[PDB]
């Protein structure tokens, strides 16, 4: 029998036990992790982007549960269906010479710009647009199945300038037009645009106040409204010898959607996008989110190239391809083991596509501890040459293992702090990436020291070319000693000799970053709808369509310019709750009816009439010359009763003789009659969105809905939508507080989905960042046991963060979903170089603060720079990517390494050289 008396003896005496047991546990996690759970589905990028458990979120979830469960023999109905049954017992533009339809937002389309920046209103450009449509769309084998038709002989014509010129100038097609048709149609537009600008000319005049010349085919209206950019025909542009057409649109007679993807993938995806006359600058085929998964999985080639560069750096630093490959195996194993823990142990069903971004992060930050442990091992061999391997192991762990933990933990804690967000995808990403970071640490203090012991024991001897080897060894020596001279002589001189320059420069940058973040221009919230969220780089044609061209065309602007009033919907008899799993996007739970509700009592009838009339007297209510007889159903019912006659006994309980507080049995009787009477007398039809009573399976009223229109207009601005929400919710809450028992539990809902998202981005970032800062300063104290070093560190970290976040604001980032996570993660990353220099400063033998800074830079500079570099390189490799999340994360990684390294190496070490503690000054007791 044999057994090691300590962990340092286990690593030294039995390395193969540690590596064998680790490899076994890893292949078990790999096998069970791929065999047991359902694989991730990335087909919707926006899955999990709704807050869950917010007041507004639960009411919004509840109102959606009510709408899916309303209908014949559903949980709820608009119609009393038991009563309904119980009563029922008693192309060529000369020959054809029209377009098949008006252009619309439902058709597949492309935006053209000029090659070489000239105006598109010329015969070469006009034909080149028709040429691209024929060449790239109508030619495709499934166009003929997808296109609209008048007969099986041919598809409909496309809507483009050349075909409007052909129909107006009696040509057969765009290909047969001549230069006189182009200038004639310009003179027609340039003179008739007046009546479009003034609002007289309109869609269907083929309006008689406009000269007939204009109204032909609706062509002048359709060109100006659909096909040309808004700046073309305005009084400011039209007085030019030729007005400048910068952009034009083409519409295809095929519908937007997943049917477009073969046409896209064959003819557009790998295309040059230019004919040499004109360039396709925007595409709207209805396939942006449907193409996401392909680009997402293809772009995994750049994280793979990043692994090869991080292997080169680490092999040159360690001088060992064995230690290097075994270190990268442990890095990748931490992603596998974290995935097994996440899906099998923690039981997360949802895996957001941002969990794939954890590979880039771990490739970048995974090897930092290997640089530390290898440096400390080499220092330990040098300062104890005659040590037994278990003593060389224990001394190496005594020096390295805590520093390695505080640096891993502060970044993991920053990821886990995002689990306070209400947004499901943010919480799921925080838990997965935080777990991979901690699993990577466990491997760096088990696997990696056992690998270092096997290397030491065997591979120092075991496992023309000899010339190439000797020449390579000579270059590797030169790089070693040049780097040693830099970190141990050059860099300490540059930091210390210019300390008063550095303190002024880095403090001025800190004040500048704080002004940009806290004063002007501050970081903004997202400013477009969730279905308009960017997924590709902004140069992609699908993103340029949304970011530029939706502003420049009149038919697209009409959708923005709409004066849409906020609805005020008030629901009783249902509980506003989210009984689904808040970590699963597809688990919305079931509708919960309220058992204390009662509309039918005389007191409930009386109060809910008075609520309707008191609400109509508010300044938030919009009065209309058209009455709405749906809005408050009890007024329309009271009105109907006051028009019922009494000479037939079959109508008697419903008589006009009855005072309004109807006996409970007359209310639930005559309401059913009134609802059935409506359905055939008026012919008005009730759908799941219509306000009224809701009946259950055997016709008892289990819910009531009211709806009113507001003065407040729907906006994407946070500050104004917060004033609508606070004004109406606090008035309705105050008014409800005096309601009868059985109406005091009602609730208000409206189009608040985007405001709830904005409110959760703002809240979750503040809390996750406050938690991330609290952990960073706490471990800084517990690492250093000195308040002065801990103050200089947290001030350098604060300057790092203000410069990092102010730089993201100058680059034009908003506080959207992944951006909001990077801001707490900045804190967690920014810790590391200040804790490493801070421990080297206290460790220093030298009594004088200058000698302590020289020892700190000398000992620690090499490993700190290798860590910064491998993270910067992992970020730089993501820059060719098509997926926007990969380019945003790689941009953040480069920037935060530069700022973090500069503030740690120069500013923090200059504070230590000017006023760093000596003896026991600032030291904390036990
Ligand atoms: C958390 C992990 C999530 C994993 C999710 C699953 C991903 C599965 C698909 C991964 C994937 C890339 C490789 C990724 C490696 C890293 C994997 C992860 C490991 C950790 C990092 C497989 O790529 C495959 O690689 C094979 C070779 O390995 C190759 O084999 C061939 O040669 C053999 C030899 O002669 C021969 O024998 C065999 O017969 C051949 O066919 C296949 O043809 C090829 O499809 C998909 O991309 C494929 O390749 C291209 C890449 O550029 C990609 O290019 C486009 O987009 C790029 C991006 O914008 C861009 O750069 C390119 O310019 C652009 O053109 C292609 O569209 C796509 O087809
Ligand atoms: C789940 C409930 C859903 C309710 C759905 C309601 C649907 C709308 C019907 C409401 C209704 C019938 C009610 C039938 C009984 C229903 C009982 C139900 C009870 C259970 C809840 C109310 O009928 C009202 O009757 C009153 C008398 O009782 C009468 O009052 C007066 O009395 C004396 C002169 O007769 C006088 O001397 C006295 O001074 C007055 O006071 C009003 O003038 C009259 O409008 C008919 O109102 C008409 O509705 C039209 C659209 O159908 C609507 O059309 C316009 O607007 C449309 C856009 O909106 C648009 O598209 C149309 O193009 C447009 O032309 C009219 O503008 C509207 O006028
Ligand atoms: C070498 C690699 C794989 C790095 C990680 C090594 C270990 C630290 C991991 C690998 C598998 C993990 C185990 C996977 C499954 C479980 C079952 C789980 O079982 C319980 O009964 C939990 C009950 C509860 O929820 O309270 C407890 C944690 C445990 C042992 C895990 C603890 C941590 C383990 C041993
Ligand atoms: C790769 C994973 C998935 C499974 C590995 C399972 C076993 C095949 C491993 C686990 C622990 C290993 C053992 C750990 C320690 C040693 C002591 C080692 O002793 C020595 O002094 C080296 C002698 C030599 O081989 O020259 C001999 C191999 C052995 C028995 C190892 C053989 C292979 C073992 C049984
Ligand atoms: C990035 C991940 C996927 C790497 C996974 C690596 C493993 C498949 C392991 C198992 C056995 C290892 C090999 C065992 C022995 C050697 C001999 C070794 O010979 C040397 O001259 C070592 C010199 C030195 O490093 O000091 C070079 C590495 C290599 C091929 C090892 C490289 C890493 C291997 C292939
Ligand atoms: C760093 C790596 C080595 C470990 C990361 C943990 C893996 C065990 C997980 C994380 C994400 C998973 C992938 C997520 C997505 C896909 C695409 C899927 O193929 C599709 O085309 C899915 C189509 C669809 O369902 O819509 C095949 C499985 C795969 C590669 C999964 C395989 C297992 C992966 C790599
Ligand atoms: C999820 C589970 C598997 C994680 C459990 C943690 C362990 C895998 C690691 C993490 C850091 C390791 C420690 C890092 C540093 C040291 C100091 C080292 O040296 C001393 O204690 C010197 C004592 C002396 O001789 O005076 C001994 C091993 C030890 C305790 C290590 C023991 C194993 C630890 C606790
Ligand atoms: C990417 C960010 C976040 C981290 C930045 C780290 C750099 C400041 C480090 C990484 C590698 C370092 C280099 C490694 C080796 C050398 C050789 C060294 O050569 C000498 O001192 C002269 C030797 C001779 O005279 O032969 C000069 C500095 C330099 C370029 C170093 C400068 C500092 C570098 C660029
Ligand atoms: C630290 C901040 C400002 C951002 C990163 C620094 C870089 C922008 C580099 C590029 C060129 C560098 C400069 C190149 C040459 C010199 C002269 C050098 O003069 C000395 O007296 C050196 C003495 C010695 O050799 O020991 C002092 C540092 C300085 C200003 C360097 C400081 C760091 C600089 C500005
Ligand atoms: C103290 C040091 C160590 C770290 C820096 C912390 C804060 C001073 C900064 C960094 C990022 C800032 C946040 C970035 C973005 C926003 C969105 C912003 O939302 C708005 O409504 C802005 C106007 C609008 O968009 O309508 C509210 C402030 C907030 C949370 C900021 C509050 C102040 C924060 C947390
Ligand atoms: C909100 C935060 C991110 C920025 C503002 C922080 C300031 C309120 C404090 C915190 C630490 C202070 C620094 C602590 C130490 C020094 C070194 C000190 O050096 C000397 O006095 C050198 C000359 C001499 O020794 O006589 C000069 C002031 C300075 C930069 C201080 C200036 C004011 C600082 C930056
Ligand atoms: C290519 C080799 C031979 C020279 C590398 C020179 C370096 C100084 C590297 C380090 C960072 C690199 C930059 C990192 C990022 C970008 C952004 C990239 O644009 C994008 O992909 C947009 C990214 C985003 O949208 O977030 C264009 C190249 C550029 C300037 C890179 C150019 C080359 C740089 C300056
Ligand atoms: C020496 C260290 C600092 C690492 C250097 C990394 C470089 C090799 C990277 C940094 C920026 C990269 C470039 C950033 C952006 C692009 C645009 C990209 O354009 C595309 O059309 C493909 C991507 C897409 O379609 O989204 C082609 C590669 C290229 C030049 C990249 C090639 C690789 C570069 C030069
Ligand atoms: C933007 C920030 C975050 C990172 C910048 C990293 C490097 C690009 C900078 C940091 C310090 C700079 C160095 C500061 C001093 C020198 C010494 C200078 O002179 C010599 O090498 C000879 C010195 C002698 O022995 O006399 C040449 C430029 C160099 C290497 C500089 C090149 C650019 C360096 C490596
Ligand atoms: C802490 C310092 C001493 C060194 C850190 C690395 C530097 C190379 C970083 C820090 C701040 C960065 C700057 C922060 C902000 C901007 C504005 C940014 O955006 C714009 O000017 C607007 C672009 C647009 O039109 O959208 C372009 C890059 C730039 C100059 C950055 C370039 C790289 C800088 C100088
Ligand atoms: C349209 O132009 C006429 C003059 O031709 C002008 O009287 C009228 O006020 C304009 N329309 C509007 C909405 O002002
Ligand atoms: C591709 O686009 C360029 C302009 O960027 C144009 O000159 C060239 O003719 C186009 N076609 C091909 C096949 O390169
Ligand atoms: C009425 O419907 C409920 C289920 O919603 C059922 O429990 C009850 O037995 C039904 N009563 C009659 C008389 O149909
Ligand atoms: Na790194
Ligand atoms: Na670490
Ligand atoms: Na950290």
Mutate to test the pocket of ligand 4, among 3, 20, 23, 29 (most ligand atoms within 8 A of CB): 20
Residue 649 neighbours by CB distance under 10 Å: 7
What would the DSSP string read from start to end of 95-144?
TT-S-SS---TTEEEEEEEETTS--S-SHHHHHHHHHHHIIIIITSTTHH
| Contact predicate 438/358, CB 8 Å | no
> Residue 276: left (phi > 0), alpha (psi -120 to 50), or beta?
left
What is the side-by-side order of every strand in the sheet holding 565-572?
693-695, 701-713, 565-572, 747-749
With a 6 A CB cut-off, is 325 part of the ligand 5 pocket?
yes
Whole-angstrom Cα Rg for the chain: 36
How many angstroms is the resolution? 2.5
Provide the 10 A C-beta neighbour count for residue 242: 13
Which residue's alpha carbon is at the smallest distance from atom 9 of ligand 10? Answer: 517
Please tell me if the CB atom of residue 696 comes closer than 6 angstroms to any atom of ligand 18: yes
For 62, 423, 442, 714, 800, the CA distances from 725, given in Å and listed in that order, are 18, 20, 49, 11, 37
Question: What whole-number distance in Å separates Cα of residue 673 and Cα of residue 644?
Answer: 11
Alpha helices in 299-357 (DSSP H): 301-318, 321-340
Ligand 6 lined by 475 (C-beta under 6 Å): no
CA 185 – CA 203 distance, rounded (Å): 18
CA 804 – ligand 15 centroid, Å? 9
- Cβ neighbors of 547 (< 8 A, separation 6 or more) are 534, 538
Provide long-range contacts, Cβ within 8 A and 24+ apart, for 612-620: 612/706, 614/735, 615/568, 615/708, 615/735, 616/708, 618/731, 619/711, 620/568, 620/710, 620/711, 620/712, 620/724, 620/727, 620/728, 620/731
The answer, yes or no, to whether any atom of ligand 10 lies below 6 A from the CB of 765, is: yes
Phi, psi of 330 (to 5 degrees): -65, -35
Q: How far is CA 758 from CA 428, 527, 809, 813, in A?
A: 19, 9, 17, 15
Q: What is the Cα–Cα distance from 150 to 157, expressed in whole angstroms?
A: 11
Exposed e or buried b for every residue in 425-453, given b needs 16+ CB within 10 A? bbbbbbbbbbbbbbbbbebbbbbbbbbbb
Q: For 620, which DSSP code?
A: T
Tokens of 189: 């537009």
User: Of the residues 114, 131, 274, which should be mutated to test ligand 17's pocket, given the most ligand atoms within 8 Å of the CB?
Assistant: 274
CA nearest ligand 4 atom 34, residue: 20
How far from 255 is each of 106, 108, 553, 815, CA to CA, in Å?
A: 6, 6, 20, 34
How far apart (Å, rounded) are the C-alpha atoms in residues 543 and 287? 12
C-beta contacts of 631-640 below 8 A and 24+ residues apart: 631/691, 631/706, 631/707, 631/708, 632/691, 632/706, 632/708, 633/691, 633/692, 633/693, 633/704, 633/706, 634/605, 634/608, 634/609, 635/609, 637/670, 637/671, 637/674, 638/609, 640/674, 640/677
Question: Does the N-terminal peptide bond of residue 521 adopt cis geometry, omega within 30 degrees of 0?
Answer: yes
Ligand nearest to the CA of 443: 3
Ligand 13, closest atom to CA 879? Answer: 14
Does 274 contact ligand 17 (Cβ within 6 A)?
yes
Element (H, E) at 715: none
Q: Is 624 exposed, middle or buried (0-12, 13-18, 19+ CB in 10 A)?
A: exposed
Query: Considering only CA atoms, which residue is closest to atom 23 of ligand 13?
Result: 880
Distance CA 33, CA 792 (A): 45
Quote the DSSP letter at residue 576: -
Residue nearest to atom 17 of ligand 14 (CA): 490
Beta bridge partners, 278, equal 114
Token code pair at residue 335: 């992603």
- The number of beta carbons lying within 10 Å of the beta carbon of residue 538 is 12
Dig out the tokens for 235 from the structure. Answer: 């009084």
Long-range contacts of 553-560 (CB under 8 A, 24+ apart): 553/226, 553/228, 553/229, 553/230, 553/249, 554/224, 554/225, 554/226, 554/230, 555/103, 555/104, 555/105, 555/225, 555/226, 556/105, 557/230, 559/105
Query: Half-sphere exposure of residue 59, counting CA atoms within 13 Å on the CB side?
Result: 18
Supply the angle between the helices 123-133 and 161-168 in degrees, to the nearest 10.
110
User: Which atom in ligand 6 lies closest to the alpha carbon of residue 43?
Assistant: 26
Question: Left if phi > 0, otherwise alpha if psi is -120 to 50, otherwise beta: which for 864?
Answer: alpha
Residues with CB under 6 A from ligand 7: 7-8, 394, 397-398, 401, 442, 445-446
CA-339 nearest atom, ligand 6: 6
Residue with tokens 């992603």: 335
Instruction: DSSP for 786-825, please give it.
Output: BHHHHHHHHHHHHHHHHHHHHHHHHTT--S-HHHHHHHHH
Ligand 4 pocket member 17 (CB < 6 A): yes
Which residue has the least CA distance to atom 9 on ligand 11?
795
Method: cryo-EM
Q: Which residues line ligand 11 (CB under 6 A)?
A: 503, 507, 510, 795, 798-799, 911, 914-915
E strands of 715-758, at which residues? 747-749
The DSSP call for residue 217 is G
Phi, psi (5° rounding) for residue 118? -70, 175
What is the best residue among 808, 814, 876 to mutate for testing ligand 12's pocket, by most ligand atoms within 8 Å of CB?
Answer: 876
Query: In whole angstroms, what is the distance from residue 172 CA to residue 163 CA?
Result: 9
Helical residues (DSSP H) of 160-300, grouped into ranges: 161-168, 179-197, 212-215, 219-222, 235-238, 261-267, 292-298
> How remote is the CA of residue 343 from the centroid of ligand 20, in Å?
25
User: Of 406, 433, 342, which Cα lies nearest the Cα of 33?
Assistant: 342
Sorted by where each starts, the structural domains of the chain and their CATH numbers stand as 107-287 (no CATH), 299-458+467-523+758-915 (1.20.1640.10), 565-713+715-750 (no CATH)
Return d(Cα 84, Cα 72) in angstroms, integer.
11
Q: Determine the residue of 4, 6, 7, 399 to mutate for testing ligand 7's pocket, defined as the one with the most ligand atoms within 8 A of the Cβ atom.
A: 7
d(CA 672, CA 284): 49
Residue closest by Cα to atom 13 of ligand 5: 322
- In ligand 7, the atom with minimum distance to the C-alpha of 441 is 10
Return d(Cα 156, Cα 163) in angstroms, integer: 12
Task: Say which residues have a Cβ less than 8 Å from residue 355's Cβ, sequence separation at least 6.
Answer: 40, 428, 429, 432, 433
CA distances from residue 696 to 75, 604, 691, 700, 704 in whole angstroms, order as listed: 6, 19, 16, 6, 12
**505 CA to centre of own chain:** 35
Pair 15, 453: CB distance under 8 Å: yes
Residue 442 Cβ inside 6 Å of ligand 3? The answer reads: yes
Alpha carbon distance 312, 862 (integer Å): 16
Q: Nearest-CA neighbor of 365 among 321, 388, 334, 394? A: 334
Tokens of 747: 């609730």
How far, in Å, CA of 613 to CA of 10, rounded?
Answer: 82
Atom of ligand 2 nearest to the CA of 642: 28
Whether 493 is in the pocket of ligand 9, judged by its Cβ within 6 Å, is: yes
Q: Report the Cα 72 to chain-centroid distance in Å.
A: 38
Report the C-alpha gap between 573 and 594 in whole angstroms: 5
Task: Return the exposure string of 467-499: e unless at least 16 CB atoms fall within 10 Å of the residue's CB, then b.
Answer: eeeeeeeeeeeeeeeeeeeebbeebbeebbeeb
Angular region, 455: left φ>0, alpha ψ -120 to 50, beta rest: alpha
Helix (H, G, I), strand (E, B) or coil at 151: strand
What separation in Å is there between the alpha carbon of 920 and the centre of ligand 10? 39
Please say whether the dihedral angle defined by the alpha carbons of residues 76, 77, 80 and 81, taken in this order, is positive or negative: negative
For ligand 7, atom 28, the nearest C-alpha belongs to: 7
Q: Give the other-Cβ count within 10 Å of 594's Cβ.
A: 16
Largest CA distance in the chain: 119
Q: Which of 481, 860, 869, 893 maximizes ligand 8 atoms within 8 Å of its Cβ, making it the mutation to test the pocket?
A: 869
**Dist. CA 695–CA 674, nearest whole Å:** 14
Residue 51 dihedral angles phi and psi, to the nearest 5°: -60, 145
Q: Residue 201's Cα: distance from chain center in Å?
A: 42
Q: Among 358, 336, 291, 351, which residue's Cα sits nearest to residue 886?
A: 358
Please give the number of the atom of ligand 5 that sits closest to the Cα of 460.
26
Q: What is the rounded distance in angstroms from the CA atom of residue 126 to the CA atom of residue 160? A: 8
Going edge to edge, which strands form the sheet with 247-255? 247-255, 107-114, 278-284
Ligand 16 proximal residues by C-beta, below 6 Å? 198-199
Show the tokens assigned to 874. Answer: 């992992």
Output the CA 761–ligand 10 centroid distance in Å.
Answer: 10
| CA distance linking residue 408 with residue 443, whole number of Å | 12
523 CA closest ligand 10 atom index: 15
Query: 502 to each of 528, 911, 913, how far by Cα in Å?
Result: 42, 10, 12
Which of 444, 463, 461, 462 has its CA nearest to residue 452?
444
Question: What does the block give as tokens for 140?
Answer: 């495709």
- As a residue count, the chain comes to 926
- Dihedral, CA of residue 883, residue 885, residue 890 and residue 896, to nearest 10: 160
Round to whole Å and give the CA distance between 616 and 514: 47
């Amino acid at each position: 029998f044999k057994f090691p008396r300590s962990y340092a003896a286990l690593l030294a005496d039995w390395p193969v036990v540690v590596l064998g047991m680790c490899t076994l546990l890893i292949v078990v996690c790999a096998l069970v992790g791929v065999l047991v759970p359902e694989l991730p589905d990335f087909s919707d990028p926006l899955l999990g982007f709704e807050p869950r458990g917010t007041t507004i979120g639960q009411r919004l979830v509840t109102w959606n549960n009510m709408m899916r469960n309303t209908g014949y023999k559903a949980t709820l109905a608009n119609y009393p269906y038991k009563y309904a049954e119980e009563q029922a017992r008693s192309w060529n533009f000369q020959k054809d010479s029209f377009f098949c339809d008006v252009p619309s937002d439902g058709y597949s389309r492309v935006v053209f710009a000029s090659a070489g920046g000239e105006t598109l209103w010329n015969l070469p450009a006009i034909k080149s647009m028709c040429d691209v449509d024929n060449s790239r769309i109508r030619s495709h084998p499934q166009f003929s199945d997808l296109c609209q038709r008048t007969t099986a002989v041919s598809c409909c014509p496309s809507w483009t300038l050349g075909n409007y010129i052909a129909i107006l100038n009696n040509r057969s097609s765009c290909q047969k037009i001549v230069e006189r048709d182009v200038s004639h149609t310009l003179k027609l537009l340039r003179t008739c645009a007046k009546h479009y600008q003034n609002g007289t000319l309109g869609p269907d005049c083929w309006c008689t106040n406009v000269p007939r010349k204009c109204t032909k085919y609706n062509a002048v209206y359709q060109i100006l409204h659909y096909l040309v950019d808004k700046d073309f025909m305005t009084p400011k542009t039209a007085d030019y010898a030729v007005p400048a057409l910068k952009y034009s649109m083409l519409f295809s007679p095929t519908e937007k959607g997943e049917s477009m993807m073969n046409i896209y993938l064959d003819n557009f995806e790998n295309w040059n996008s230019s004919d040499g006359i004109t360039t396709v600058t925007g595409i709207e085929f209805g396939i942006k989110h449907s193409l996401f998964q392909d680009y997402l999985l293809m772009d995994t080639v750049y994280p793979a190239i990043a692994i090869a560069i991080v292997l080169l750096i680490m092999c040159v630093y360690t001088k060992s391809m064995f230690i290097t490959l075994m270190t990268m195996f442990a890095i990748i194993s931490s992603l596998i083991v974290s995935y097994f823990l996440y899906r099998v142990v923690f039981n997360f069903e949802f895996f957001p596509f941002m969990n794939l971004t954890a590979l880039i992060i771990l490739v970048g930050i995974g090897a930092d501890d290997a640089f530390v442990l290898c440096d400390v091992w080499n220092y330990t061999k040098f300062d104890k040459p005659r040590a037994e391997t278990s003593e060389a192991v224990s001394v190496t762990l005594q020096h390295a293992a805590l520093s390695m933990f505080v640096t891993s933990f502060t970044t993991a804690a920053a990821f886990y702090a995002n689990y306070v967000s209400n947004i499901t995808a943010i919480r799921c990403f925080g838990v997965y990436a935080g777990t991979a970071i901690l699993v990577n640490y466990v491997l760096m203090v088990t696997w990696l020291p056992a690998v270092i012991v096997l290397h030491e024991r065997y591979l120092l001897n075991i496992f023309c070319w000899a010339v190439l080897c000797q020449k390579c060894r000579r270059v590797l020596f030169a790089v070693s000693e040049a780097s040693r001279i830099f970190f141990e002589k050059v860099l300490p001189c540059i930091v210390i000799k210019f300390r008063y320059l550095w303190l002024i420069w880095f403090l001025a940058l800190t004040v500048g970053g704080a002004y940009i973040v806290c004063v002007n221009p501050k970081m903004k919230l997202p400013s477009l709808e969730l279905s308009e969220f960017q997924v590709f780089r902004s140069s992609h044609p699908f993103e340029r369509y949304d970011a530029e061209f939706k502003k420049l065309f009149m038919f697209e602007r009409v959708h923005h310019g709409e004066e849409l009033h906020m609805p005020i919907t008030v629901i009783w008899g249902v509980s506003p709750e989210d009984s689904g799993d808040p970590l699963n996007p597809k688990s919305k739970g079931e509708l919960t009816l309220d058992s204390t509700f009662n509309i039918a009592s005389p007191a409930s009838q009386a109060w809910i009439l008075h609520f309707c009339q008191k609400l109509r007297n508010q300044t938030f209510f919009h009065q209309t010359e058209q009455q709405d007889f749906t809005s408050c159903f009890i007024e329309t019912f009271k009105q109907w009763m006051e028009n019922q006659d009494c000479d037939e006994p079959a109508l008697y309980p419903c008589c006009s003789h009855c005072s309004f507080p109807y006996k409970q049995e007359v209310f639930e009787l005559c309401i059913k009659k009134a609802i059935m009477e409506l359905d055939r007398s008026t012919g008005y039809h009730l759908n799941n969105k219509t306000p009224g009573p809701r009946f259950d399976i055997n016709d008892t009223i289990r819910a009531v809905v009211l709806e009113f229109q507001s003065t407040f207009l729907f906006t994407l601005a946070y500050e104004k939508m917060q004033q609508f929400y606070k004004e109406v919710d606090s008035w309705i809450s105050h008014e409800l507080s005096s309601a009868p028992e059985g109406l005091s539990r009602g609730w208000f809902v409206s189009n608040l989905e985007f405001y709830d998202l904005q409110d959760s981005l703002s809240d979750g970032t503040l809390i996750a960042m406050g938690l991330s800062v609290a952990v960073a300063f706490s471990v800084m104290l517990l690492t250093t046991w000195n308040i002065i070093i801990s103050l200089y560190a947290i001030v350098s970290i604060a300057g790092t963060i203000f410069v990092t976040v102010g730089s993201l604001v100058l680059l034009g980032w908003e506080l959207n979903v992944l951006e909001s996570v990077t801001i707490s993660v900045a804190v967690g990353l920014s810790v590391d170089f200040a804790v490493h220099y801070g421990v080297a400063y206290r460790l220093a033998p030298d009594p004088d603060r200058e000698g302590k800074v020289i020892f700190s830079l000398s000992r620690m500079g090499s490993a700190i720079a290798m860590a910064a570099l491998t993270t910067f390189v992992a970020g730089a490799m993501m820059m060719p990517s098509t997926v926007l999340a990969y380019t945003q994360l790689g941009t953040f990684m480069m920037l935060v390494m530069c700022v973090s390294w500069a503030f740690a190496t120069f500013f923090f070490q200059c504070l230590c050289r000017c006023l760093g503690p000596q003896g026991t000054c600032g030291q904390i007791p036990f």
